């Protein structure tokens, strides 16, 4: 908050970049609050106390609303430091942004390295509004925001900034937007902080950081979501443990939006392993956040189950490009929610994957097979991946699944149902349409209506399709049909046959 101690004692928090690399995440920062704002070109005086000869903490100046992160690292020496605040190039900043920003501390050393905790004091800076979980209260900080927005009007050279520090995160937005958003929405910064922490917790659980080993343990970092000037770039961006969002998304940030846009960026930050294909695998994170909220996954949103995946995998003779590639892995995660953390754990701690596109694909098949104790070669080759003779040899040490796991789809959670009851009754009816197509519609009993995830269609003894919908059009009939319904745990019904 804006009435904090002038002398800060700094924890020796270790090098978060190095710790990151151990765990294959993308060089997370570990910025810690000061609550001070500065203008580019102003002088500040910083007093630093460390044991003689020991390494000193650093100051981070962060310019507001850059197309980049906006940070400059400022080195400090023991004793007095007369510092001129630096200035970012004008052309990097959203038009009309003051040359100004805020100070954080970075202290990337261990106790053993640094000795006694550094103490620092900063003179000549201005307090900007900020909430620090465990320190601040909502009433005061809202008052701080009211006061600072007024001060902004009087001195437009000051940075338009409000920060929320949680245990594990930083949310950086403008003060003017923050004040409006909290008031109009009847919300408080304490909630921004608590929700941010919940996101990191859920993310790290999903990724398999379960404290089972060093590469699976938490460490000292502060994940950062910050306002960036992204008008010309993509919608949002990622890197270095930072999510960037544009002006209009400040409310998403403060609300701790867990929709596709935000979580896709966090996903990029949580895996850099060059042994895998992170552009594919990082989508597992936003998909999960969709599922845990009951939201139809992007795979449903892009109509890919029906357009791409399900018709492809059914046949017996075996932005969106990326969802197709992730589909087989998502299906395994729909089938068993313990899959992904364990899969991530394998790639974090084992000499697997690497090499070409195709080599990494083959590694997924082997790793997923080990995790499940199932021979998943068929599963992956049904998605159109080329599984090699040796991979099949490797995986053939396990039994094949007895379920057609490639029929998994979002209905498995969206139904909020169970398995087929003993009373299951379903029927199919064919009509000839559009000239000479066979249009087969499906009806199911009321008790089982939310137990079904789709129907497999066979003709003259060959599987010709699977749809998660109530209708299938057979465009390729010149015939006896056989229909098998599938439930939320991918169990088949008895067949329904007609001629």
PDB file of N, CA and C in Angstrom, residues 134-231:
ATOM      1  N   UNK A 134      -1.864  -9.750   2.209  1.00  0.00           N
ATOM      2  CA  UNK A 134      -1.300 -10.064   3.507  1.00  0.00           C
ATOM      3  C   UNK A 134      -0.859  -8.805   4.246  1.00  0.00           C
ATOM      4  N   UNK A 135      -0.926  -7.656   3.571  1.00  0.00           N
ATOM      5  CA  UNK A 135      -0.497  -6.406   4.174  1.00  0.00           C
ATOM      6  C   UNK A 135      -1.640  -5.393   4.140  1.00  0.00           C
ATOM      7  N   UNK A 136      -2.296  -5.264   2.984  1.00  0.00           N
ATOM      8  CA  UNK A 136      -3.146  -4.120   2.705  1.00  0.00           C
ATOM      9  C   UNK A 136      -4.604  -4.453   3.014  1.00  0.00           C
ATOM     10  N   UNK A 137      -5.441  -3.414   3.146  1.00  0.00           N
ATOM     11  CA  UNK A 137      -6.884  -3.608   3.172  1.00  0.00           C
ATOM     12  C   UNK A 137      -7.530  -2.862   2.003  1.00  0.00           C
ATOM     13  N   UNK A 138      -8.698  -3.356   1.585  1.00  0.00           N
ATOM     14  CA  UNK A 138      -9.387  -2.862   0.403  1.00  0.00           C
ATOM     15  C   UNK A 138      -9.797  -1.397   0.540  1.00  0.00           C
ATOM     16  N   UNK A 139     -10.315  -1.021   1.723  1.00  0.00           N
ATOM     17  CA  UNK A 139     -10.801   0.332   1.947  1.00  0.00           C
ATOM     18  C   UNK A 139      -9.677   1.343   1.729  1.00  0.00           C
ATOM     19  N   UNK A 140      -8.526   1.113   2.360  1.00  0.00           N
ATOM     20  CA  UNK A 140      -7.404   2.027   2.218  1.00  0.00           C
ATOM     21  C   UNK A 140      -6.954   2.133   0.760  1.00  0.00           C
ATOM     22  N   UNK A 141      -6.856   0.992   0.076  1.00  0.00           N
ATOM     23  CA  UNK A 141      -6.199   1.003  -1.226  1.00  0.00           C
ATOM     24  C   UNK A 141      -7.113   1.712  -2.224  1.00  0.00           C
ATOM     25  N   UNK A 142      -8.425   1.515  -2.052  1.00  0.00           N
ATOM     26  CA  UNK A 142      -9.418   2.226  -2.844  1.00  0.00           C
ATOM     27  C   UNK A 142      -9.316   3.736  -2.612  1.00  0.00           C
ATOM     28  N   UNK A 143      -9.036   4.136  -1.362  1.00  0.00           N
ATOM     29  CA  UNK A 143      -8.785   5.533  -1.033  1.00  0.00           C
ATOM     30  C   UNK A 143      -7.513   6.012  -1.728  1.00  0.00           C
ATOM     31  N   UNK A 144      -6.452   5.190  -1.674  1.00  0.00           N
ATOM     32  CA  UNK A 144      -5.205   5.468  -2.373  1.00  0.00           C
ATOM     33  C   UNK A 144      -5.471   5.705  -3.859  1.00  0.00           C
ATOM     34  N   UNK A 145      -6.337   4.879  -4.456  1.00  0.00           N
ATOM     35  CA  UNK A 145      -6.629   4.977  -5.878  1.00  0.00           C
ATOM     36  C   UNK A 145      -7.339   6.295  -6.187  1.00  0.00           C
ATOM     37  N   UNK A 146      -8.327   6.661  -5.353  1.00  0.00           N
ATOM     38  CA  UNK A 146      -9.053   7.912  -5.522  1.00  0.00           C
ATOM     39  C   UNK A 146      -8.068   9.079  -5.471  1.00  0.00           C
ATOM     40  N   UNK A 147      -7.132   9.045  -4.516  1.00  0.00           N
ATOM     41  CA  UNK A 147      -6.222  10.165  -4.323  1.00  0.00           C
ATOM     42  C   UNK A 147      -5.270  10.284  -5.510  1.00  0.00           C
ATOM     43  N   UNK A 148      -4.824   9.131  -6.034  1.00  0.00           N
ATOM     44  CA  UNK A 148      -3.766   9.114  -7.038  1.00  0.00           C
ATOM     45  C   UNK A 148      -4.318   9.513  -8.402  1.00  0.00           C
ATOM     46  N   UNK A 149      -5.543   9.070  -8.703  1.00  0.00           N
ATOM     47  CA  UNK A 149      -6.198   9.465  -9.939  1.00  0.00           C
ATOM     48  C   UNK A 149      -6.350  10.992  -9.958  1.00  0.00           C
ATOM     49  N   UNK A 150      -6.652  11.583  -8.792  1.00  0.00           N
ATOM     50  CA  UNK A 150      -6.746  13.035  -8.715  1.00  0.00           C
ATOM     51  C   UNK A 150      -5.375  13.647  -9.000  1.00  0.00           C
ATOM     52  N   UNK A 151      -4.334  13.061  -8.396  1.00  0.00           N
ATOM     53  CA  UNK A 151      -2.985  13.589  -8.519  1.00  0.00           C
ATOM     54  C   UNK A 151      -2.536  13.515  -9.978  1.00  0.00           C
ATOM     55  N   UNK A 152      -2.915  12.431 -10.671  1.00  0.00           N
ATOM     56  CA  UNK A 152      -2.642  12.244 -12.089  1.00  0.00           C
ATOM     57  C   UNK A 152      -3.124  13.443 -12.903  1.00  0.00           C
ATOM     58  N   UNK A 153      -4.373  13.865 -12.668  1.00  0.00           N
ATOM     59  CA  UNK A 153      -4.949  15.019 -13.343  1.00  0.00           C
ATOM     60  C   UNK A 153      -4.082  16.260 -13.140  1.00  0.00           C
ATOM     61  N   UNK A 154      -3.498  16.403 -11.948  1.00  0.00           N
ATOM     62  CA  UNK A 154      -2.702  17.577 -11.621  1.00  0.00           C
ATOM     63  C   UNK A 154      -1.297  17.466 -12.217  1.00  0.00           C
ATOM     64  N   UNK A 155      -0.759  16.241 -12.277  1.00  0.00           N
ATOM     65  CA  UNK A 155       0.571  16.009 -12.826  1.00  0.00           C
ATOM     66  C   UNK A 155       0.517  14.837 -13.806  1.00  0.00           C
ATOM     67  N   UNK A 156       0.228  15.111 -15.100  1.00  0.00           N
ATOM     68  CA  UNK A 156       0.146  14.073 -16.130  1.00  0.00           C
ATOM     69  C   UNK A 156       1.472  13.409 -16.510  1.00  0.00           C
ATOM     70  N   UNK A 157       2.592  13.908 -15.964  1.00  0.00           N
ATOM     71  CA  UNK A 157       3.900  13.305 -16.186  1.00  0.00           C
ATOM     72  C   UNK A 157       4.071  12.052 -15.324  1.00  0.00           C
ATOM     73  N   UNK A 158       3.210  11.883 -14.303  1.00  0.00           N
ATOM     74  CA  UNK A 158       3.241  10.705 -13.437  1.00  0.00           C
ATOM     75  C   UNK A 158       2.732   9.479 -14.196  1.00  0.00           C
ATOM     76  N   UNK A 159       3.150   8.233 -13.848  1.00  0.00           N
ATOM     77  CA  UNK A 159       2.632   7.043 -14.530  1.00  0.00           C
ATOM     78  C   UNK A 159       1.198   6.743 -14.082  1.00  0.00           C
ATOM     79  N   UNK A 160       0.334   6.400 -15.046  1.00  0.00           N
ATOM     80  CA  UNK A 160      -1.012   5.925 -14.759  1.00  0.00           C
ATOM     81  C   UNK A 160      -0.915   4.427 -14.462  1.00  0.00           C
ATOM     82  N   UNK A 161      -0.862   4.064 -13.175  1.00  0.00           N
ATOM     83  CA  UNK A 161      -0.512   2.698 -12.808  1.00  0.00           C
ATOM     84  C   UNK A 161      -1.195   2.293 -11.504  1.00  0.00           C
ATOM     85  N   UNK A 162      -1.668   1.032 -11.464  1.00  0.00           N
ATOM     86  CA  UNK A 162      -2.079   0.351 -10.242  1.00  0.00           C
ATOM     87  C   UNK A 162      -1.609  -1.101 -10.285  1.00  0.00           C
ATOM     88  N   UNK A 163      -0.986  -1.564  -9.188  1.00  0.00           N
ATOM     89  CA  UNK A 163      -0.467  -2.928  -9.128  1.00  0.00           C
ATOM     90  C   UNK A 163      -1.191  -3.725  -8.051  1.00  0.00           C
ATOM     91  N   UNK A 164      -1.502  -4.994  -8.360  1.00  0.00           N
ATOM     92  CA  UNK A 164      -1.911  -5.962  -7.351  1.00  0.00           C
ATOM     93  C   UNK A 164      -0.831  -7.034  -7.230  1.00  0.00           C
ATOM     94  N   UNK A 165      -0.240  -7.134  -6.031  1.00  0.00           N
ATOM     95  CA  UNK A 165       0.681  -8.204  -5.680  1.00  0.00           C
ATOM     96  C   UNK A 165      -0.052  -9.256  -4.859  1.00  0.00           C
ATOM     97  N   UNK A 166      -0.071 -10.485  -5.383  1.00  0.00           N
ATOM     98  CA  UNK A 166      -0.586 -11.630  -4.649  1.00  0.00           C
ATOM     99  C   UNK A 166       0.604 -12.381  -4.060  1.00  0.00           C
ATOM    100  N   UNK A 167       0.391 -13.610  -3.568  1.00  0.00           N
ATOM    101  CA  UNK A 167       1.526 -14.397  -3.110  1.00  0.00           C
ATOM    102  C   UNK A 167       2.454 -14.697  -4.285  1.00  0.00           C
ATOM    103  N   UNK A 168       1.856 -14.982  -5.451  1.00  0.00           N
ATOM    104  CA  UNK A 168       2.616 -15.587  -6.535  1.00  0.00           C
ATOM    105  C   UNK A 168       2.552 -14.748  -7.805  1.00  0.00           C
ATOM    106  N   UNK A 169       1.793 -13.640  -7.802  1.00  0.00           N
ATOM    107  CA  UNK A 169       1.589 -12.921  -9.053  1.00  0.00           C
ATOM    108  C   UNK A 169       1.643 -11.408  -8.874  1.00  0.00           C
ATOM    109  N   UNK A 170       1.759 -10.742 -10.029  1.00  0.00           N
ATOM    110  CA  UNK A 170       1.586  -9.305 -10.184  1.00  0.00           C
ATOM    111  C   UNK A 170       0.593  -9.056 -11.319  1.00  0.00           C
ATOM    112  N   UNK A 171      -0.390  -8.197 -11.039  1.00  0.00           N
ATOM    113  CA  UNK A 171      -1.278  -7.675 -12.066  1.00  0.00           C
ATOM    114  C   UNK A 171      -1.044  -6.165 -12.150  1.00  0.00           C
ATOM    115  N   UNK A 172      -0.598  -5.716 -13.330  1.00  0.00           N
ATOM    116  CA  UNK A 172      -0.196  -4.343 -13.593  1.00  0.00           C
ATOM    117  C   UNK A 172      -1.138  -3.750 -14.639  1.00  0.00           C
ATOM    118  N   UNK A 173      -1.886  -2.706 -14.241  1.00  0.00           N
ATOM    119  CA  UNK A 173      -2.851  -2.009 -15.085  1.00  0.00           C
ATOM    120  C   UNK A 173      -2.730  -0.507 -14.815  1.00  0.00           C
ATOM    121  N   UNK A 174      -3.596   0.305 -15.445  1.00  0.00           N
ATOM    122  CA  UNK A 174      -3.629   1.734 -15.146  1.00  0.00           C
ATOM    123  C   UNK A 174      -4.483   1.984 -13.905  1.00  0.00           C
ATOM    124  N   UNK A 175      -4.178   3.081 -13.200  1.00  0.00           N
ATOM    125  CA  UNK A 175      -4.921   3.490 -12.013  1.00  0.00           C
ATOM    126  C   UNK A 175      -6.339   3.931 -12.390  1.00  0.00           C
ATOM    127  N   UNK A 176      -6.454   4.655 -13.508  1.00  0.00           N
ATOM    128  CA  UNK A 176      -7.716   5.227 -13.949  1.00  0.00           C
ATOM    129  C   UNK A 176      -8.708   4.116 -14.286  1.00  0.00           C
ATOM    130  N   UNK A 177      -8.222   3.079 -14.980  1.00  0.00           N
ATOM    131  CA  UNK A 177      -9.065   1.945 -15.320  1.00  0.00           C
ATOM    132  C   UNK A 177      -9.409   1.140 -14.066  1.00  0.00           C
ATOM    133  N   UNK A 178      -8.396   0.846 -13.242  1.00  0.00           N
ATOM    134  CA  UNK A 178      -8.598   0.051 -12.040  1.00  0.00           C
ATOM    135  C   UNK A 178      -9.691   0.664 -11.166  1.00  0.00           C
ATOM    136  N   UNK A 179      -9.641   1.989 -10.968  1.00  0.00           N
ATOM    137  CA  UNK A 179     -10.565   2.633 -10.043  1.00  0.00           C
ATOM    138  C   UNK A 179     -11.999   2.529 -10.572  1.00  0.00           C
ATOM    139  N   UNK A 180     -12.164   2.765 -11.881  1.00  0.00           N
ATOM    140  CA  UNK A 180     -13.442   2.682 -12.567  1.00  0.00           C
ATOM    141  C   UNK A 180     -13.994   1.259 -12.502  1.00  0.00           C
ATOM    142  N   UNK A 181     -13.130   0.264 -12.728  1.00  0.00           N
ATOM    143  CA  UNK A 181     -13.558  -1.122 -12.854  1.00  0.00           C
ATOM    144  C   UNK A 181     -14.034  -1.683 -11.512  1.00  0.00           C
ATOM    145  N   UNK A 182     -13.265  -1.446 -10.445  1.00  0.00           N
ATOM    146  CA  UNK A 182     -13.641  -1.895  -9.115  1.00  0.00           C
ATOM    147  C   UNK A 182     -14.980  -1.272  -8.712  1.00  0.00           C
ATOM    148  N   UNK A 183     -15.131   0.044  -8.932  1.00  0.00           N
ATOM    149  CA  UNK A 183     -16.333   0.753  -8.522  1.00  0.00           C
ATOM    150  C   UNK A 183     -17.543   0.272  -9.320  1.00  0.00           C
ATOM    151  N   UNK A 184     -17.431   0.235 -10.660  1.00  0.00           N
ATOM    152  CA  UNK A 184     -18.553  -0.113 -11.523  1.00  0.00           C
ATOM    153  C   UNK A 184     -18.981  -1.569 -11.343  1.00  0.00           C
ATOM    154  N   UNK A 185     -18.078  -2.414 -10.827  1.00  0.00           N
ATOM    155  CA  UNK A 185     -18.310  -3.848 -10.781  1.00  0.00           C
ATOM    156  C   UNK A 185     -18.519  -4.317  -9.343  1.00  0.00           C
ATOM    157  N   UNK A 186     -18.401  -3.384  -8.392  1.00  0.00           N
ATOM    158  CA  UNK A 186     -18.525  -3.672  -6.970  1.00  0.00           C
ATOM    159  C   UNK A 186     -17.553  -4.775  -6.568  1.00  0.00           C
ATOM    160  N   UNK A 187     -16.282  -4.590  -6.923  1.00  0.00           N
ATOM    161  CA  UNK A 187     -15.257  -5.570  -6.613  1.00  0.00           C
ATOM    162  C   UNK A 187     -14.081  -4.860  -5.959  1.00  0.00           C
ATOM    163  N   UNK A 188     -13.216  -5.641  -5.304  1.00  0.00           N
ATOM    164  CA  UNK A 188     -12.103  -5.095  -4.547  1.00  0.00           C
ATOM    165  C   UNK A 188     -10.804  -5.794  -4.953  1.00  0.00           C
ATOM    166  N   UNK A 189      -9.643  -5.103  -4.849  1.00  0.00           N
ATOM    167  CA  UNK A 189      -8.360  -5.692  -5.232  1.00  0.00           C
ATOM    168  C   UNK A 189      -7.991  -6.969  -4.484  1.00  0.00           C
ATOM    169  N   UNK A 190      -8.460  -7.118  -3.238  1.00  0.00           N
ATOM    170  CA  UNK A 190      -8.143  -8.317  -2.475  1.00  0.00           C
ATOM    171  C   UNK A 190      -8.575  -9.568  -3.240  1.00  0.00           C
ATOM    172  N   UNK A 191      -9.657  -9.437  -4.021  1.00  0.00           N
ATOM    173  CA  UNK A 191     -10.200 -10.535  -4.807  1.00  0.00           C
ATOM    174  C   UNK A 191      -9.346 -10.789  -6.054  1.00  0.00           C
ATOM    175  N   UNK A 192      -8.819  -9.710  -6.639  1.00  0.00           N
ATOM    176  CA  UNK A 192      -7.903  -9.836  -7.762  1.00  0.00           C
ATOM    177  C   UNK A 192      -6.721 -10.704  -7.350  1.00  0.00           C
ATOM    178  N   UNK A 193      -6.219 -10.470  -6.133  1.00  0.00           N
ATOM    179  CA  UNK A 193      -5.015 -11.127  -5.654  1.00  0.00           C
ATOM    180  C   UNK A 193      -5.311 -12.591  -5.355  1.00  0.00           C
ATOM    181  N   UNK A 194      -6.443 -12.835  -4.687  1.00  0.00           N
ATOM    182  CA  UNK A 194      -6.766 -14.185  -4.245  1.00  0.00           C
ATOM    183  C   UNK A 194      -7.002 -15.090  -5.451  1.00  0.00           C
ATOM    184  N   UNK A 195      -7.656 -14.532  -6.472  1.00  0.00           N
ATOM    185  CA  UNK A 195      -8.010 -15.297  -7.653  1.00  0.00           C
ATOM    186  C   UNK A 195      -6.754 -15.598  -8.467  1.00  0.00           C
ATOM    187  N   UNK A 196      -5.834 -14.626  -8.521  1.00  0.00           N
ATOM    188  CA  UNK A 196      -4.575 -14.807  -9.230  1.00  0.00           C
ATOM    189  C   UNK A 196      -3.822 -15.999  -8.647  1.00  0.00           C
ATOM    190  N   UNK A 197      -3.801 -16.086  -7.309  1.00  0.00           N
ATOM    191  CA  UNK A 197      -3.103 -17.153  -6.607  1.00  0.00           C
ATOM    192  C   UNK A 197      -3.745 -18.500  -6.930  1.00  0.00           C
ATOM    193  N   UNK A 198      -5.081 -18.524  -6.986  1.00  0.00           N
ATOM    194  CA  UNK A 198      -5.815 -19.739  -7.300  1.00  0.00           C
ATOM    195  C   UNK A 198      -5.441 -20.225  -8.702  1.00  0.00           C
ATOM    196  N   UNK A 199      -5.207 -19.293  -9.639  1.00  0.00           N
ATOM    197  CA  UNK A 199      -4.871 -19.680 -11.004  1.00  0.00           C
ATOM    198  C   UNK A 199      -3.511 -20.385 -11.019  1.00  0.00           C
ATOM    199  N   UNK A 200      -2.521 -19.823 -10.301  1.00  0.00           N
ATOM    200  CA  UNK A 200      -1.174 -20.385 -10.282  1.00  0.00           C
ATOM    201  C   UNK A 200      -1.186 -21.754  -9.594  1.00  0.00           C
ATOM    202  N   UNK A 201      -1.934 -21.860  -8.489  1.00  0.00           N
ATOM    203  CA  UNK A 201      -2.099 -23.122  -7.777  1.00  0.00           C
ATOM    204  C   UNK A 201      -2.638 -24.191  -8.732  1.00  0.00           C
ATOM    205  N   UNK A 202      -3.785 -23.912  -9.358  1.00  0.00           N
ATOM    206  CA  UNK A 202      -4.431 -24.861 -10.254  1.00  0.00           C
ATOM    207  C   UNK A 202      -3.479 -25.215 -11.403  1.00  0.00           C
ATOM    208  N   UNK A 203      -2.784 -24.209 -11.951  1.00  0.00           N
ATOM    209  CA  UNK A 203      -1.875 -24.418 -13.069  1.00  0.00           C
ATOM    210  C   UNK A 203      -0.737 -25.347 -12.661  1.00  0.00           C
ATOM    211  N   UNK A 204      -0.200 -25.127 -11.462  1.00  0.00           N
ATOM    212  CA  UNK A 204       0.971 -25.887 -11.081  1.00  0.00           C
ATOM    213  C   UNK A 204       0.585 -27.323 -10.724  1.00  0.00           C
ATOM    214  N   UNK A 205      -0.591 -27.502 -10.111  1.00  0.00           N
ATOM    215  CA  UNK A 205      -1.145 -28.836  -9.922  1.00  0.00           C
ATOM    216  C   UNK A 205      -1.312 -29.550 -11.272  1.00  0.00           C
ATOM    217  N   UNK A 206      -1.976 -28.898 -12.232  1.00  0.00           N
ATOM    218  CA  UNK A 206      -2.194 -29.490 -13.546  1.00  0.00           C
ATOM    219  C   UNK A 206      -0.879 -29.880 -14.223  1.00  0.00           C
ATOM    220  N   UNK A 207       0.196 -29.116 -13.967  1.00  0.00           N
ATOM    221  CA  UNK A 207       1.476 -29.316 -14.631  1.00  0.00           C
ATOM    222  C   UNK A 207       2.335 -30.344 -13.887  1.00  0.00           C
ATOM    223  N   UNK A 208       1.862 -30.798 -12.717  1.00  0.00           N
ATOM    224  CA  UNK A 208       2.520 -31.859 -11.967  1.00  0.00           C
ATOM    225  C   UNK A 208       3.629 -31.386 -11.024  1.00  0.00           C
ATOM    226  N   UNK A 209       3.593 -30.107 -10.620  1.00  0.00           N
ATOM    227  CA  UNK A 209       4.497 -29.610  -9.586  1.00  0.00           C
ATOM    228  C   UNK A 209       3.940 -30.006  -8.222  1.00  0.00           C
ATOM    229  N   UNK A 210       4.259 -31.228  -7.784  1.00  0.00           N
ATOM    230  CA  UNK A 210       3.592 -31.807  -6.628  1.00  0.00           C
ATOM    231  C   UNK A 210       4.577 -31.969  -5.469  1.00  0.00           C
ATOM    232  N   UNK A 211       5.790 -31.421  -5.627  1.00  0.00           N
ATOM    233  CA  UNK A 211       6.804 -31.423  -4.579  1.00  0.00           C
ATOM    234  C   UNK A 211       7.455 -32.805  -4.484  1.00  0.00           C
ATOM    235  N   UNK A 212       7.310 -33.620  -5.537  1.00  0.00           N
ATOM    236  CA  UNK A 212       7.805 -34.986  -5.537  1.00  0.00           C
ATOM    237  C   UNK A 212       9.307 -35.038  -5.823  1.00  0.00           C
ATOM    238  N   UNK A 213       9.868 -33.932  -6.334  1.00  0.00           N
ATOM    239  CA  UNK A 213      11.286 -33.817  -6.641  1.00  0.00           C
ATOM    240  C   UNK A 213      11.593 -32.353  -6.937  1.00  0.00           C
ATOM    241  N   UNK A 214      12.870 -32.039  -7.190  1.00  0.00           N
ATOM    242  CA  UNK A 214      13.257 -30.653  -7.399  1.00  0.00           C
ATOM    243  C   UNK A 214      12.552 -30.088  -8.635  1.00  0.00           C
ATOM    244  N   UNK A 215      12.554 -30.861  -9.733  1.00  0.00           N
ATOM    245  CA  UNK A 215      11.985 -30.423 -11.000  1.00  0.00           C
ATOM    246  C   UNK A 215      10.461 -30.390 -10.908  1.00  0.00           C
ATOM    247  N   UNK A 216       9.910 -30.843  -9.777  1.00  0.00           N
ATOM    248  CA  UNK A 216       8.470 -30.860  -9.577  1.00  0.00           C
ATOM    249  C   UNK A 216       8.090 -30.013  -8.365  1.00  0.00           C
ATOM    250  N   UNK A 217       8.983 -29.103  -7.947  1.00  0.00           N
ATOM    251  CA  UNK A 217       8.707 -28.271  -6.782  1.00  0.00           C
ATOM    252  C   UNK A 217       8.470 -26.823  -7.190  1.00  0.00           C
ATOM    253  N   UNK A 218       7.718 -26.123  -6.338  1.00  0.00           N
ATOM    254  CA  UNK A 218       7.539 -24.684  -6.385  1.00  0.00           C
ATOM    255  C   UNK A 218       8.897 -24.020  -6.156  1.00  0.00           C
ATOM    256  N   UNK A 219       8.999 -22.729  -6.484  1.00  0.00           N
ATOM    257  CA  UNK A 219      10.225 -21.966  -6.261  1.00  0.00           C
ATOM    258  C   UNK A 219       9.849 -20.491  -6.119  1.00  0.00           C
ATOM    259  N   UNK A 220      10.836 -19.620  -5.857  1.00  0.00           N
ATOM    260  CA  UNK A 220      10.530 -18.203  -5.680  1.00  0.00           C
ATOM    261  C   UNK A 220      10.401 -17.539  -7.047  1.00  0.00           C
ATOM    262  N   UNK A 221       9.187 -17.067  -7.366  1.00  0.00           N
ATOM    263  CA  UNK A 221       8.930 -16.304  -8.576  1.00  0.00           C
ATOM    264  C   UNK A 221       7.716 -15.398  -8.376  1.00  0.00           C
ATOM    265  N   UNK A 222       7.534 -14.445  -9.290  1.00  0.00           N
ATOM    266  CA  UNK A 222       6.283 -13.706  -9.324  1.00  0.00           C
ATOM    267  C   UNK A 222       5.810 -13.634 -10.772  1.00  0.00           C
ATOM    268  N   UNK A 223       4.727 -14.366 -11.074  1.00  0.00           N
ATOM    269  CA  UNK A 223       4.180 -14.350 -12.422  1.00  0.00           C
ATOM    270  C   UNK A 223       3.583 -12.967 -12.646  1.00  0.00           C
ATOM    271  N   UNK A 224       3.745 -12.442 -13.868  1.00  0.00           N
ATOM    272  CA  UNK A 224       3.352 -11.074 -14.181  1.00  0.00           C
ATOM    273  C   UNK A 224       2.389 -11.066 -15.367  1.00  0.00           C
ATOM    274  N   UNK A 225       1.221 -10.440 -15.161  1.00  0.00           N
ATOM    275  CA  UNK A 225       0.346  -9.994 -16.238  1.00  0.00           C
ATOM    276  C   UNK A 225       0.361  -8.468 -16.266  1.00  0.00           C
ATOM    277  N   UNK A 226       0.717  -7.882 -17.410  1.00  0.00           N
ATOM    278  CA  UNK A 226       0.850  -6.434 -17.465  1.00  0.00           C
ATOM    279  C   UNK A 226       0.225  -5.889 -18.747  1.00  0.00           C
ATOM    280  N   UNK A 227      -0.223  -4.633 -18.661  1.00  0.00           N
ATOM    281  CA  UNK A 227      -0.724  -3.887 -19.795  1.00  0.00           C
ATOM    282  C   UNK A 227       0.423  -3.698 -20.780  1.00  0.00           C
ATOM    283  N   UNK A 228       0.148  -3.981 -22.056  1.00  0.00           N
ATOM    284  CA  UNK A 228       1.117  -3.745 -23.112  1.00  0.00           C
ATOM    285  C   UNK A 228       0.402  -3.121 -24.304  1.00  0.00           C
ATOM    286  N   UNK A 229       1.176  -2.441 -25.151  1.00  0.00           N
ATOM    287  CA  UNK A 229       0.620  -1.851 -26.355  1.00  0.00           C
ATOM    288  C   UNK A 229       0.691  -2.895 -27.466  1.00  0.00           C
ATOM    289  N   UNK A 230      -0.432  -3.572 -27.734  1.00  0.00           N
ATOM    290  CA  UNK A 230      -0.376  -4.741 -28.598  1.00  0.00           C
ATOM    291  C   UNK A 230      -1.190  -4.520 -29.870  1.00  0.00           C
ATOM    292  N   UNK A 231      -1.545  -3.258 -30.151  1.00  0.00           N
ATOM    293  CA  UNK A 231      -2.489  -2.925 -31.208  1.00  0.00           C
ATOM    294  C   UNK A 231      -2.089  -3.588 -32.523  1.00  0.00           C
TER     295      UNK A 231
END
